[PDB]
Paper text:
Aldehyde–alcohol dehydrogenase (AdhE) is a multifunctional enzyme containing two enzymatic domains responsible for aldehyde dehydrogenase (ALDH) and alcohol dehydrogenase (ADH) activities. AdhE is a bifunctional enzyme having two catalytic activities responsible for two consecutive reactions converting acetyl-CoA to ethanol. AdhE forms long helical filaments called spirosome and this spirosome formation is critical for the AdhE activity.
Here, we present the atomic resolution (3.43 Å) cryo-EM structure of AdhE in an extended spirosome form in the presence of cofactors. The cryo-EM structure reveals that AdhE forms a right-handed spirosome with 130 Å width, and four AdhE molecules make one helical turn with a pitch of 120 Å, which is consistent with the previous SAXS analysis on an extended AdhE spirosome. In one helical turn, ALDH and ADH domains from two AdhE molecules are intertwined to form a dimer, and two dimers make a tetramer by interacting with each other via their ADH domains. The AdhE dimer in an extended spirosome is widened by about 10° compared with the dimer in the compact spirosome. In contrast, in the extended conformation where NAD+ is bound, the NAD+ binding pocket is widely exposed. Furthermore, the interaction between the ALDH and ADH domains of two different AdhE molecules creates a channel between the two catalytic sites, which is located at the inside of the spirosome. Considering that ALDH and ADH catalytic activities mediate consecutive reactions converting acetyl-CoA to ethanol via acetaldehyde as an intermediate, it is likely that the channel observed plays a role in conveying the intermediate product.
Residue numbers in the entry:
A (entry chain D): 347 to 869
B (entry chain C): 1 to 445
C (entry chain D): 198 to 247
D (entry chain E): 446 to 495
E (entry chain E): 644 to 743
């Protein structure tokens, strides 16, 4: 009685004899394009013939010139076949492939402008004035707002005629609860530039509230998913910068978060530190000036400067370490060898040493933005979030054992990478020990690692660092009850995938036990 | 819910057949929502699924099943992220052809015991990508790890928009319950991975079946190779999950020009060269009754020597036996599924390929070979090796465990954990199985 | 035969039988649709598949 | 008092490099919505398949 | 071979003038010295061999860009000022002019 009833009767006529062989349809194929697609969607055959005699049109190269000519017409898995096509010579081939080795594409991604000198805070802030920005949001710490550090930015900004607003309610660790508070302030103010004034946690909380202001429907449970490789991850970060730029003014001289695509934020429901890593979190401008670093106390200068040593030391031995980030990893260790003892003792009376340490933390930030950290920062994120040890103190205790852990000739379960030839972390640790001049002109490879370990054993001695985690204020009844949970949490903290060794969970608790009791790790 | 015998098995397939025919009318847009959310929660549970598969079977390293469950959930998502499999694939206006994709239907899924949870992630993701269902029948040794792995993908898909019962699994397998599933009248395909006794059974029921076989991996290291690369890549891939992976390096063939330097590079590192009494003490522990015994499959290298009757150091990783004959009488020329090697010596490069041609004769006819040489300065040897070896994939300067599966070291092989061998080994694919094999292309002429 | 060709343990490329339902709706060419059915069904007295 | 001139470190937004990363980097400019491209080459590089 | 020797010696002068310049800061001193370390060890190997030592032809192609990181932010000295005039007057190719 209708066209749509005729296809219904035809669907029951391919039910009795032959499930997916061949149907046919006669209509004007030019004036009716909606009926030739409804008939192709309903009929469960292998070939759909239109205005064609089915004997000459079922076989190929007649009336169509695009079907493959054959006299054995397949029906697919509807009729119990495995072709669903016309059988030709391409079904009897057994294709054999020869796959040669290729290397993973590396990169060197930085902010668009890294401005740095002694007093280049207002000269760099005049660039964001002339770019047409009229509404700015400034994310600071609570200490920096009460000490006039946030007033050095608002005085230059409001003198040119922009609308500023200061969010000064971040903590030492940027939990997720104080991020959605600033993201609620963001879309109620609608800024055009987010200035992340601060050293660590004020910058990591500003990068995530840059996401939730740009795309307010993103889930934190999908940002914190651990990938195996970037450019092949499941949750792609959306393209940001469509209504808000990011300026990154740093104050502490230990963390290069102004150039790295990292944002370590706490979940605040289970108490876990999650390093969120994708290159959409890179700021558009990093301002590293040493006028904000002069009045830094001695406890923050020693915690920061020893953290930036471990930044350039793990980015040099990593598997993603190429020739582009080996010069910056060694330059940041040359400056931190000569000036970090001078910047701690002399403090603010020796400004030319406080400036070089503040630059060497950012140069180390160039290194591990493109060649990520190893297993020392994977354990330091869990050790710092469990017992409230500040970041910079945690990885300073751990670095002397990870160097003895990674420097092995035949390690158990070396990692998989196409660029990484063999386990060669012991040679690259010896290339540091003579670039810094720590070695005599005649030495073996195993003797240069001892002079490297003896250097940062005295460097932590004259900087007020304790010898163990027990001397840092951790009870043995509390540490030994969580040393199995922290050894499994550090296995999947997304910095594990760049270590030269792929660590076992039994080996990661051996480093944590030998660092609490003050021993040295021996396999 | 549970399935233990044939009376409630037919109630499981009839539940799946009802819920598949309303999933077969989905669009391209609302399948990519399901396929993304299923892979998003299958990589989230890479840690607990890896600890269950070692607690159940006890034949692997827990740290290696993490990056195998991660490979089966984010590399399978990345290659088939935007691939047309549901609606109109192509269309020609000058010739007048429309190519429409379809589903196949219910698929019998047969997982092995070596990869009990990673193939359950892989076969589930490529099934609901092509808008069809799958019924799992796990190995009885590792039945609880597979049924838990398919449950995380199912409960994440229903929250995304899938039907109520799309992925079913046999809760308690048997040799009769699995045979009753393969002879069911309303299933259409058998995705079956296992040994050579299973491929003969998967192609014996009257149904189109996509089977894969086992296989050796003869390695040819000629005189112009990188000795520091070739030794360090064999140790990485053979100790990857203690060699339970298909296409792992079961035997190497070194030329006589660099045979001594390769042995010294193996001896100073984690390899242990067996000499004299220890060589014969391990040849009677691998072949039990003319077949590979299940007591050494996936065990570490110090437990195989402890089962043989001596003691190696606890940190040794590869048991090397220098053998001479290429035959079924030598037990070291077989598939071992354990960190154990077999070093052969050849007098030339063209003699090393001849010994490698006889090493793909015993176990696995067309699975995987390998070759280590400089691929730029020697283009005549990479074409002579590709013409002589009758395998499905030829790996050059590549660890065979990470290089047999795709998207690692090559970026052009299709990533899959079911590696075909072609009609040499009695298969019908000769490729890596992806979502393009479960389509049933329909043309409108 | 397809049930027997896929019953031996070997990769088999089988094809089956089949009907061919024809739909001639109201906007078709009646002189073309009738004369093409008579040509193809009498082609070798209809022994051809499809 | 003496002050110092503001220095900088300005680079391209992405510096992709390895042995064969020409088509893997060209897939980024495909997904950015670019539809019309102009390629400025030398006369030798056009006649030699580059 | 004529283009490999003209180019690789040009990139030596790129990293050597960007290291002694007055705009040379601590950010572009590591990249200026890294590009001279790679051009010392592989540029004789990349000229003699060529495509028979690809791992040496790759490091020279990377060391020219690492030197490009150096003089993008700390500009060249007086050697390239004379080489632009010496090369445009007598048609000497760039790379040969600043090498002399
Ligand atoms: N972005 C990254 O890639 C990255 C890398 C490492 C660590 N982090 C995160 O950052 C945190 C470390 O940050 P941090 O310790 O460098 O800074 P911080 O935010 O921890 O600052 C420490 C405290 O000192 C005060 N302070 C900050 N700057 C000061 C100054 N100039 N003068 C006087 N007092 C000052 C602040 O009030 C603050 O409470 C870690 O918790 C870690 O999670 C991020
Ligand atoms: N081709 C590949 O990519 C690949 C991948 C992994 C493993 N494999 C092969 O599989 C083996 C892994 O060990 P395994 O114990 O799984 O091998 P196996 O042959 O014992 O296979 C076990 C599975 O096959 C099924 N099976 C076994 N005999 C059967 C029969 N008579 N009828 C119906 N079903 C049957 C069972 O359901 C079981 O789950 C290896 O030896 C390897 O060669 C191949
Ligand atoms: N689409 C196509 O490719 C195509 C083409 C022509 C014919 N056909 C089908 O074939 C039929 C034509 O009659 P037919 O006599 O050729 O069909 P048929 O099934 O009687 O085929 C007979 C041939 O198949 C073999 N055969 C039959 N039963 C067998 C068994 N149990 N085991 C092993 N071998 C067996 C015999 O060797 C015999 O020569 C039609 O009904 C049609 O559906 C299909
Ligand atoms: Zn740090
Ligand atoms: Zn020049």
């Amino acid at each position: 009685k209708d066209f749509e009833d005729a296809v219904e009767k035809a669907e029951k006529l391919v039910a009795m004899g032959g499930i997916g062989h061949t149907s046919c349809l006669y209509t004007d194929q030019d004036n009716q394009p909606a009926r030739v697609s409804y008939f192709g969607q309903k009929m469960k055959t292998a070939r759909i013939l239109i205005n064609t005699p089915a004997s000459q049109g079922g076989i190929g190269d007649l009336y169509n010139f695009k079907l493959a000519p054959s006299l054995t017409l397949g029906c697919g898995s509807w009729g119990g076949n495995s072709i669903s096509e016309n059988v030709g010579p391409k079904h009897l081939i057994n294709k054999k492939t020869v796959a040669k080795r290729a290397e993973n594409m590396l990169w060197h991604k930085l902010p668009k402008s890294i401005y740095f000198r002694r007093g280049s805070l207002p000269i760099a802030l005049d660039e964001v004035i002339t770019d047409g920005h009229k509404r700015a949001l400034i994310v600071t710490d609570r200490f920096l707002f009460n000490n006039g550090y946030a007033d050095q930015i608002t005085s230059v900004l409001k003198a040119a005629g922009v609308e500023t607003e200061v969010f000064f309610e971040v903590e030492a660790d940027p939990t997720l609860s104080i991020v959605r508070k600033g993201a609620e302030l963001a879309n109620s103010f609608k800024p055009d530039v987010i200035i992340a004034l601060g050293g660590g946690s004020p910058m990591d909380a500003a990068k995530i509230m840059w996401v939730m202001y740009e795309h307010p429907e993103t889930h934190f449970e999908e940002l914190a998913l651990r990938f195996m490789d970037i450019r092949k991850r499941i949750y792609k970060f959306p393209k940001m910068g469509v209504k808000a730029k990011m300026i990154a003014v740093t104050t502490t001289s230990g963390t290069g978060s102004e150039v790295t695509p990292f944002a370590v934020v706490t979940d605040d429901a289970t108490g876990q530190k999650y390093p969120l890593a994708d290159y959409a979190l890179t700021p558009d401008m990093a301002i590293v000036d040493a006028n904000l670093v002069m009045d830094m106390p001695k406890s923050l200068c020693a915690f920061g400067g020893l953290d930036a040593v471990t930044h350039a030391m793990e980015a040099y031995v990593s598997v993603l370490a190429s020739e582009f980030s080996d010069g910056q990893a060694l330059q940041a260790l040359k400056l931190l060898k000569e000036y970090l003892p001078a910047s701690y003792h002399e403090g603010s009376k020796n400004p030319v040493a406080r400036e070089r340490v503040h630059s060497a933390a950012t140069i180390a930030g160039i290194a591990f933005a493109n060649a990520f950290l190893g297993v020392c920062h994977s354990m330091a994120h869990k050790l710092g979030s469990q017992f409230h040890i500040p970041h910079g103190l945690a990885n300073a205790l751990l670095i002397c054992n990870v160097i003895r852990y990674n420097a092995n000739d035949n390690p158990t379960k070396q990692t998989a990478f196409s660029q990484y030839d063999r386990p060669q972390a012991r040679r690259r640790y010896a290339e540091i020990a003579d670039h810094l001049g720590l070695s005599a002109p005649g030495d073996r490879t195993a003797a240069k690692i001892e002079k490297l370990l003896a250097w940062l054993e005295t460097l932590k001695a004259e900087l007020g660092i304790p010898k163990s985690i027990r001397e840092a204020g951790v009870q043995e009844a509390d540490f030994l009850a969580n040393v199995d949970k922290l050894s499994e949490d550090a296995f999947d903290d997304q910095c594990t995938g760049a270590n030269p060794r792929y660590p076992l969970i039994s080996e990661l608790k051996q480093i944590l036990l030998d660092t609490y009791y003050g021993r040295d790790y021996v396999e | 819910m549970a399935v233990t015998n044939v009376a409630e098995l037919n109630a499981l397939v009839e539940r799946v057949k009802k819920a598949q025919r309303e999933y077969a009318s989905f669009t391209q847009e609302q399948v990519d929502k399901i396929f993304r959310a299923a892979a998003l929660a299958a990589a989230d549970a890479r840690i607990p699924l890896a600890k269950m598969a070692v607690a159940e079977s006890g034949m692997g390293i827990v740290e290696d099943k993490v990056i195998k469950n991660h490979f089966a959930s984010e590399y399978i998502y990345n290659a088939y992220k935007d691939e047309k499999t549901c609606g109109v694939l192509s269309e020609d206006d000058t010739f007048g052809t429309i190519t429409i994709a379809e589903p196949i239907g219910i698929i019998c899924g047969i997982v092995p015991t070596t990869n009990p949870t990673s193939t359950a992630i892989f076969k589930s993701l490529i099934s609901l990508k092509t808008r069809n269902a799958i019924i799992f029948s796990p190995h009885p040794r590792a039945k609880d790890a597979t049924n838990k792995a398919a449950d995380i993908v199912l409960q994440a898909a229903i929250a995304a928009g899938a039907p109520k019962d799309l992925i079913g699994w046999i809760d308690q397998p048997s040799v009769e319950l699995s045979n009753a599933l393969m002879h069911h009248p309303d299933i259409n395909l058998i995705l079956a991975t296992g040994g050579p006794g299973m491929v003969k059974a998967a192609y014996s029921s009257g149904k189109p079946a996509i089977g894969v076989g086992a296989g050796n991996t003869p390695v040819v290291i000629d005189e112009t190779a990188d000795i520091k690369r070739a030794v360090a890549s064999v140790l990485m891939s053979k100790t990857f999950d203690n060699g339970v992976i298909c296409a792992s390096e079961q035997s190497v063939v070194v030329v006589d020009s660099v045979y001594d330097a390769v042995r010294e590079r193996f001896a100073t590192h984690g390899g242990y060269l067996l000499q004299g009494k220890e060589l014969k003490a391990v040849q009677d522990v691998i072949l039990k009754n003319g077949a590979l015994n299940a007591a050494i499959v996936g065990q570490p290298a110090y437990k195989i020597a402890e089962l043989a009757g001596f003691s190696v150091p606890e940190n040794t990783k590869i048991l090397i036996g220098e053998v001479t004959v290429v035959d079924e009488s030598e037990p070291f020329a077989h598939e071992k599924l354990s960190p154990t090697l077999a070093m052969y010596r050849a007098k030339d490069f063209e003699d090393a390929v001849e010994k490698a041609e006889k090493l793909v004769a015993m176990g696995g006819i067309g699975h995987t070979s390998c070759l280590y040489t400089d691929q730029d300065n020697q283009p005549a040897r990479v074409s002579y090796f590709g013409q002589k070896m009758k395998t499905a994939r030829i790996l050059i300067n590549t660890p065979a465990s990470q290089g047999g599966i795709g998207d690692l070291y090559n970026f052009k092989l299709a990533p899959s954990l079911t590696l075909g061998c072609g009609s040499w080994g009695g298969n019908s694919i000769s490729e890596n199985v992806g979502p393009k094999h479960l389509i049933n292309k329909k043309t409108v002429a």
